[PDB]
Amino acid sequence: HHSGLVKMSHPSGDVEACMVQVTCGSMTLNGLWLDNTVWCPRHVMCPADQLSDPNYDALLISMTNHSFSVQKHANLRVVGHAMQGTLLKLTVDVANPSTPAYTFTTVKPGAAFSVLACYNGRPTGTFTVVMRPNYTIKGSFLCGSCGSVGYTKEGSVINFCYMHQMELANGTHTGSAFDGTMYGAFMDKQVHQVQLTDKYCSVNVVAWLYAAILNGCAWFVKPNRTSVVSFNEWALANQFTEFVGTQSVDMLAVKTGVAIEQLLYAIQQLYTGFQGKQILGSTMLEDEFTPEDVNMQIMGVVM
Amino acid sequence: HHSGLVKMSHPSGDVEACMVQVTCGSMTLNGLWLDNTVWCPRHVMCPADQLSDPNYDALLISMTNHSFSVQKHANLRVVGHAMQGTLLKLTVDVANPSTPAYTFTTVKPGAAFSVLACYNGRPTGTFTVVMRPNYTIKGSFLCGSCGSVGYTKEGSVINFCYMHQMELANGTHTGSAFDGTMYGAFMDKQVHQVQLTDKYCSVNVVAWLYAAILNGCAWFVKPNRTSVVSFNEWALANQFTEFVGTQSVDMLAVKTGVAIEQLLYAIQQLYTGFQGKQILGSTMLEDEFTPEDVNMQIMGVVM
Ligand SMILES: *[C@@H](O)[C@H](C[C@@H]1CCNC1=O)NC(=O)[C@H](CC(C)C)NC(=O)OC[C@H]1C[C@@H]1C1CCC(F)(F)CC1
Ligand SMILES: *[C@@H](O)[C@H](C[C@@H]1CCNC1=O)NC(=O)[C@H](CC(C)C)NC(=O)OC[C@H]1C[C@@H]1C1CCC(F)(F)CC1
């Protein structure tokens, strides 16, 4: 009756030890301290009368090293400063003694990551989200949360993928990769911005339907099959992502004995209606769990 | 369109530094190391041929101090051992140098807490759950997760409320308070056990309907009111908890200008059907968010 699925985040201790507070006299937000570097959103340089159309190149030239105040909850003297896209790269006199093994990587639509929400450099909560097909996330962020970071963990290595920047008109959120790009077409300017349509993440729905089978729920499984190619043509007219299978999904097909194409056909039928039935206690398709989530939490398999 | 509500856990770093591995030669599970004490489930003493009907008093007498192996990922020499209800209280030679300020407290149905899931003493994930009215939680726990701990945080103080013990036939979970009692009527014996009916947590549904209003969603609000007394009589015949208002809920009534009794009436009407409409993207009543969750994540208010 219970799927055994929860929104599961990584333990956050490693990342908590990397969070600092950064201020410029106007805004206060959070930075990520690794080795001798502190990363933070560049709109820390903005006075609040210019958040709608800043000239960041000019604001940056106007700063010097002691323009930036970096504190831990210590004071970290800034000895170098630079701008990469929508992030600042501050250089500090002290190497973080608790720097974890880490990489920077970009997360793809449908993938889950863990977020450490911070205010004034103080971590206050953790949660997990999936990158939506329109490069937003359905987060929980208030004023002062910018600089909060998202990350995945492979083994002992932390793969930082997100630095929080802003909220959109519809309540969702977006931010930067650590190459300084914003996800999607977004700009770090407090103005109305076009928003791309969101879509169902077809791979994650398939994962969820497998999770239902692994919990004894399979009324929706019929011998009928939709091929991947046919499903993807259907997908395009129904605001579903195109499906791309993975080894993680294949393992789920092996364990249950149910082929991907059976579940692609089931999504097509379920999209038009659950006929009053429930799947894992839901009457709507669920796309916030990944194949890796289902393999890990139900089957006991990382990879 | 997006509620700004996520399942939000506490940052887990403080508790990660307290987790150890405990073994007796049969089972390996997790313990919680605070000052000179290590807490762990008592069925670490069981050989796997006796998990269905152990004699814990006799197993305990049969143990000595070096029967228990406690390791951190160190070795902590056990110098004392005792049993409190369904937990063991091991005394070790070394005080945990990172013991947080803490209390032990019991969590009540409807209240949310954070869980650190651990295997072999290694923290592997964090998530948050509400204690169901039948004293289970809808967790994510596999073999070797016993000893994983649940906790709330008031200020800097960690209020430990849960040590994981077992899974039930229906996929939900339960465990001990740190006074050694199991929640509800449950026993730490691997046998079939009666399960109490679960119910909607009426206070948390009200919280959720307030969260909808705070996000511009209020079609369900009518001038009609159901008094608390009348709602609670209704509650008893419909598998809802009886409603008990709090200051947290009152603040939500103040902010929105919508009285509790309007929402009690709305639950009664919504219970019988959403008439095809959605609330915060859901066609079912939602009871996994507390008034404190809505105050914190949407309104910015702790208390
Ligand atoms: C961190 O500094 C801060 C986090 C935001 C604040 C509230 N929730 C969050 O996630 N970031 C900002 O305040 C940024 C700063 C810019 C220079 C990038 N701005 C916003 O997030 O603005 C809030 C948008 C929802 C407001 C609004 C924007 C104009 C509009 F389009 F017309 C209507 C929507
Ligand atoms: C930690 O040691 C372990 C965590 C469990 C394992 C799987 N998921 C979890 O949360 N705890 C146990 O294995 C306990 C040990 C007892 C001495 C308390 N036992 C169980 O959790 O048993 C699993 C129950 C689901 C099994 C079953 C029980 C008999 C039944 F009722 F007939 C049918 C249901």
Across chain A, the runs of DSSP E, i.e. the strands, are 19-23, 28-34, 37-41, 69-71, 75-76, 78-84, 87-92, 102-104, 112-119, 122-130, 149-154, 157-167, 173-176
Tell me the DSSP string of A135-155.
S-B-----TT-TT-EEEEEET
- The minimum-distance atom of ligand 1 relative to the CA of A52 is 17
CA–CA dist A105, A96 (Å, integer): 21
A217-247 in b/e burial notation, b at 16+ Cβ within 10 A?
A: bbebbeeeebebeebbebbeeeebbebeeee
CA–CA dist B172, A232 (Å, integer): 36
Q: What number of other Cβ atoms are within 10 A of residue A275's Cβ? A: 10
Structure-block tokens of residue A249: 């999904």
What is the third-level CATH fold of A202-299? main proteinase (3clpro) structure, domain 3 (1.10.1840)
Contact criterion met (CB below 8 Å) for A175 and A168:
no
Chain A residues at the B interface, defined by Cβ less than 8 Å, are 1-14, 16-17, 116-117, 123-127, 129, 138-143, 170-172, 215, 283-284, 297, 300
CA–CA dist A231, A227 (Å, integer): 6
Beta bridge partners of A164: A175
CA–CA dist A292, A208 (Å, integer): 11
CA–CA dist B180, A295 (Å, integer): 33
Q: Is A161 a catalytic residue?
A: no
DSSP A53: S
* A188 ligand 1 Cβ < 6 A: yes
Way the structure was solved: X-ray
Q: Residues near A247 by Cβ (< 8 Å), separated by ≥ 6?
A: A303
Nearest to A7 among B3, B7, B14 (CB): B7
CA–CA dist A59, A206 (Å, integer): 48
Locate tokens 């937990």: which residue? B87
Question: Resolution to 1 decimal, in Å?
Answer: 2.0
Contact criterion met (CB below 8 Å) for A204 and A242:
no
The phi, psi pair for B210, rounded to 5°, reads -65, -45
Contacts with B2 from chain A: Cβ below 8 Å: 138, 170-172
- The minimum-distance atom of ligand 2 relative to the CA of B147 is 1
Which residue in the list A144, A147, A150, A175 is annotated as catalytic? A144
B43-78 in b/e burial notation, b at 16+ Cβ within 10 A?
A: bbbbeeeebeebebeebeeebeeebbbbebeeebeb
CA A75 to chain centre: 30
**Among candidates B26, B71, B68, which has minimal Cα distance to B47?**
B26
Residue A124 distance to chain B (closest CA, Å): 6
3-state helix, strand, coil in chain A (%, to 5): 25, 25, 50
Provide the phi-psi class of A55: left if phi over 0, else alpha when psi is between -120 and 50, else beta: beta
CATH code of domain B13-92:
2.40.10.10
Q: What number of other Cβ atoms are within 10 A of residue A206's Cβ? A: 25
